[PDB]
């Protein structure tokens, strides 16, 4: 299990994570639970025709002869009375369900996989006959490429005899096409199949017909008691297959198959659903893309790690939803201790300083357990926030070095009020565009909204010509933003998860609710007169406000001017000043806080703070 099986296992688990995997269920799995296998039936047919009793051609021919000479009724009756025995499912069914397959292709004709699927609760669109493919009620398919008995027990519902296999292409064209396209567009894991099976042979012939590097090599699980020979392994490796053996993996007896199925399948499911080098490689892929964004909200770093570790706004992290290794705890010991971080690979260490450059710039420090005294040092490296109103004009006329600056100068125009030209090159970035494409897309939508509301304000001066107002409406009225995040590459909406809320009009839906609980909590502290010895609920409000403000300004989101954002900023300062006034008569003013009160507060509100 050194090299030639670990590659397969990480590939399969990666495909399962993406949702792109399909399990080609064989007949060994269905016969593992007791079920009358085919050769019993064919030898029964022989005993009917002859006195005493097997190659594959005979398997196909004896039922064919019985059908030919004895007719239809007898064959139908014997098949019905031999295949009507209902049986309970086996654990391999619930395992193969728990692996969460997108579609399931089975060459079995028993209603066994579907029963387990219903018991688990997942809903699959069963496909049995020809016509059922058109009336698919879901996007997840349970293909029975050899029919079933659901429509009835009559023989032609399934394929067993020789002529049925001859006329398979012309009798099941749609199902064959579905099988071929599902094999092409997914990854395929063969389970419970003998290496000399006829279906495997035809499928390998078809994949031989295709051109080179036009598919992923499917994975085939073998479980025969004999250890795999090298010769057949080479023969099937060059035949576009990658094969995993349970005989070489463990040792067991020849007459039991449940344990050997369970060993490989449990290894598959349990393995990542270790050492430092894997850890730093693990979080690099999850952290490398975000270098495009200058600032990251700490309350969103949980979503980066699928809510693994809870990030506190003060720079402290406590294990939230980790049941495996403490990978990021290990990373911090690489940060605090240079000795263990020194013993790392060059490429990993070259990765490591990048996050070392990252995690320092976003304020995260260490655990909450290991935390000490933390200073509330927040800097805003955004020119618009500092109000250097001459500078962006200087920053605008300069030629754009790259597309990143093209977005930056585009927002500077929006900061300068000339949103007409700002929109004009906003389409240019979309034309020139890929994370910024999403950022260019929505800001183009937000900037339209401000102008339209501004148009009603003035009319209810002619800043914009009607043709610019005509062109803005044709491209936009069709454009919808709810589907924008879903309408994105699978990698993008999986990699960039913390960017979902910029799409919807309610960009601060969560941030409002979490502040209200603190707000009522803070106003609770007003009357009861209770000191906050620990990190106060009021401080984290300031820390949250500094977190949200930095992201919006540094990353150039048009939400920096919307009334919902302005009201959100205004209501945060109102209570923080309110607490400080009561604390003084039982927080001190700074330049950074001077900007927000001057920028987002109305005149009447300032009187309200003075009055109270």
């Amino acid at each position: 299990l050194d090299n030639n099986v670990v590659e397969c296992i990480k590939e399969i688990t990666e495909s399962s994570r993406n949702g792109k995997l399909v399990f080609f269920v064989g007949a060994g799995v269905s016969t593992l639970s007791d079920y009358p296998q085919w050769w019993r039936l064919v030898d029964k047919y022989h005993e009917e025709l002859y006195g005493s009793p097997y190659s594959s051609d005979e398997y196909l021919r004896i039922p064919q002869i019985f059908y030919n000479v004895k007719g239809e009724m007898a064959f139908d009756g014997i098949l019905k009375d031999f295949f009507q025995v209902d049986k309970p499912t086996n654990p391999i069914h619930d395992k193969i369900l728990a692996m969460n397959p997108a579609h399931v292709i089975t060459t079995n004709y028993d209603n066994l996989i579907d029963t387990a699927c219903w018991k688990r609760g997942k809903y699959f669109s069963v496909i049995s006959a020809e016509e059922d493919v058109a009336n698919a009620t879901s996007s997840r398919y349970l293909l029975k490429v050899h029919g079933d008995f659901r429509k009835g027990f009559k023989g032609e519902n399934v394929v067993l005899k020789e002529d049925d296999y001859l006329n398979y292409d012309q009798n099941y064209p749609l199902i064959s096409n579905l099988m071929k396209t599902i094999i092409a567009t997914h990854t395929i894991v063969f389970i419970g199949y003998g290496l000399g099976d006829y279906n495997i042979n035809m499928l390998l012939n078809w994949v031989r017909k295709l051109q080179k590097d036009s598919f992923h090599k499917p994975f085939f699980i073998r479980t025969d008691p004999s250890p795999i020979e090298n010769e057949t392994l080479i023969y099937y490796e060059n035949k576009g297959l990658r094969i995993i053996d349970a005989a070489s993996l463990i040792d067991s007896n020849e007459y039991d198959y449940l344990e050997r199925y369970s060993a490989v399948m449990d290894l598959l499911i349990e393995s990542q659903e270790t050492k430092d080098d894997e850890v730093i490689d693990y979080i690099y892929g999850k952290i490398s893309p975000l270098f495009a964004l200058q600032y990251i909200r700490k309350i969103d770093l949980k979503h980066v790690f699928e809510y693994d570790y809870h990030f506190e706004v003060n720079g402290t992290v406590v294990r939230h939803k980790n049941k495996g290794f403490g990978y990021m705890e290990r990373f911090f010991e690489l940060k605090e201790s240079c000795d263990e971080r020194s013993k790392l690979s060059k490429k990993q260490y070259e990765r490591f300083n990048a996050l070392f450059n990252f995690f320092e710039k976003n304020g995260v420090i260490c655990m909450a357990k290991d935390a000490g005294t933390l200073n509330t040092s927040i800097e805003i490296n955004s020119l618009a926030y500092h109000g250097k109103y001459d500078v962006m004009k200087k920053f605008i006329e300069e030629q754009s070095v790259s597309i990143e600056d093209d977005y930056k100068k585009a927002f500077f125009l929006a900061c300068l009020g000339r949103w007409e030209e700002s929109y004009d090159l906003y389409s240019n970035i979309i034309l020139n565009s890929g994370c910024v494409y999403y950022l260019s897309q929505i800001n183009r939508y937000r900037i339209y909204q401000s102008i339209t509301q501004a148009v009603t304000q003035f009319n209810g001066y002619k800043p914009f010509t009607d043709e610019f107002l005509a062109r803005i409406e044709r491209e936009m009225t069709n454009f919808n933003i709810d589907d924008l995040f879903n309408g994105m590459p699978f990698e993008f909406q999986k990699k960039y998860k913390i960017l979902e809320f910029l799409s919807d009009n309610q960009f601060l839906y969560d941030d409002t609710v979490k502040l209200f609980e603190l707000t009522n909590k803070v106003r609770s502290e007003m009357s009861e007169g209770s000191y906050s010895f620990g990190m106060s609920s009021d401080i984290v409000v300031l820390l949250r406000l500094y977190d949200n403000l930095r992201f919006l300004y540094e990353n150039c989101l048009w939400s920096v001017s919307f009334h919902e954002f302005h009201q959100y900023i205004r209501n945060s300062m109102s209570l923080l000043i309110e607490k400080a006034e009561y604390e003084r008569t039982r927080f001190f003013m700074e330049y950074y806080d001077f900007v927000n009160i001057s920028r987002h507060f109305k005149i009447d509100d300032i009187k309200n703070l003075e009055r109270s």
């Binding site: 406590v318 502290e525 007169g529 209770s530 000191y531 906050s532 010895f533 620990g534």
Partner: protein
């Protein structure tokens, strides 16, 4: 960021270690009409404390299969009892917050003591 040490009154065994977050000393009077004679100085003094992070000792949880709380220069609180109120959230949950109040005995008539 005061550290809380909760122990049993009978022994010196640490029940748990926590991080103090809030403390209330909002003492006040009771209803005057319902409660010339010598002055008594009746009051409804109450003290409450709340911690946001807690951690129970391994030995305590192993052996458990009146109290005293001291939080840190450092201040004690004798005869303290917890308020075992629980509420569950739809979001999976993770900061176990523990609130406890100091009892007042009739014989000693004191609730809080602080040493320096």
């Amino acid at each position: 960021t005061a550290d809380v040490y909760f122990k049993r009154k009978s022994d010196g065994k640490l029940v748990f270690t926590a991080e103090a977050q809030t403390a209330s000393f909002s003492q006040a009077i009771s209803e005057e009409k319902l409660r010339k004679p010598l002055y008594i100085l009746k009051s409804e003094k109450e003290i409450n404390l709340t911690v946001k992070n807690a951690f129970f000792d391994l030995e305590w949880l192993a052996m458990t299969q009146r109290y005293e709380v001291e939080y840190r220069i450092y201040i004690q609180f004798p005869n303290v009892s917890p308020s075992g109120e629980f509420e569950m959230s739809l979001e999976n949950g993770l900061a176990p917050e523990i609130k406890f109040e100091a009892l007042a005995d009739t014989d000693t008539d004191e609730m809080a003591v602080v040493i320096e």
